[PDB]
Amino acid sequence: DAFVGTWKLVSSENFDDYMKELGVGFATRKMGGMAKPNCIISVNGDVITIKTESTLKNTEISFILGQEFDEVTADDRKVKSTITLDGGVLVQVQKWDGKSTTIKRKREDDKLVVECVMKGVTCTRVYERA
Ligand SMILES: O=C(O)[C@H]1CCCC[C@H]1COc1ccc(Cl)c(Cl)c1
């Protein structure tokens, strides 16, 4: 839709702090921090696929909106994830061990903007079309 495409990371603010609040260790933070992934979003009927590709680590999720699914995150958390579409924003919550984080993906001009919150920490990542 507005989201379908191949997107390349162009900016990131507060991602180290976000990863620290998730409990990610120093080695993984160091690798994730200077990664510049691509994010490839596609849709086939009810099923949306988001692939994240980078030199040291790739991930993929496929989901139906509103249907919880199991996910292994890039930092190896085992989470229960739910994604909905709200006012044109893809809103993802991850739940594990009584904790949660939310990841909002939105389209703004030429940007795919990703806002990630864990407790008091807010990270903003911007992708542009490859
Ligand atoms: O920008 C995003 O898509 C956000 C979304 C939420 C998880 C956190 C980010 C994913 O972050 C990384 C960062 C580095 C690597 Cl190498 C990989 Cl596979 C994922």
Curated annotation (Swiss-Prot):
GO molecular function, one term: fatty acid binding
This protein's record includes keyword Nucleus: yes
Effect of residue 21 to D: In a breast cancer sample; somatic mutation
Phosphotyrosine PTM positions: 18
Record keywords: Acetylation, Cytoplasm, Lipid-binding, Nucleus, Phosphoprotein, Transport
Keyword Cytoplasm part of the UniProt annotation: yes
Pfam annotation, one family: Lipocalin
Residue ranges of the motif Nuclear localization signal: 20-30
CC per GO annotation: cytoplasm; cytosol; extracellular exosome; lipid droplet; nucleus
Family annotation (SUPFAM superfamilies): Lipocalins (SSF50814)
GO biological process: brown fat cell differentiation; cellular response to lithium ion; cellular response to tumor necrosis factor; cholesterol homeostasis; fatty acid transport; long-chain fatty acid transport; negative regulation of DNA-templated transcription; positive regulation of cold-induced thermogenesis
CDD domains in the cross-refs: FABP4
Subcellular location: Cytoplasm; Nucleus
Record-listed Phosphoserine modification sites: 11
Binding, a fatty acid: 125-127
Domain remarks: Forms a beta-barrel structure that accommodates hydrophobic ligands in its interior.
Subunit comment: Monomer. Homodimer. Interacts with PPARG.
Similarity comment: family membership: Belongs to the calycin superfamily. Fatty-acid binding protein (FABP) family.
Role, per record: Lipid transport protein in adipocytes. Binds both long chain fatty acids and retinoic acid. Delivers long-chain fatty acids and retinoic acid to their cognate receptors in the nucleus.
Protein name: Fatty acid-binding protein, adipocyte
Native species: Homo sapiens (Human)
Gene: FABP4
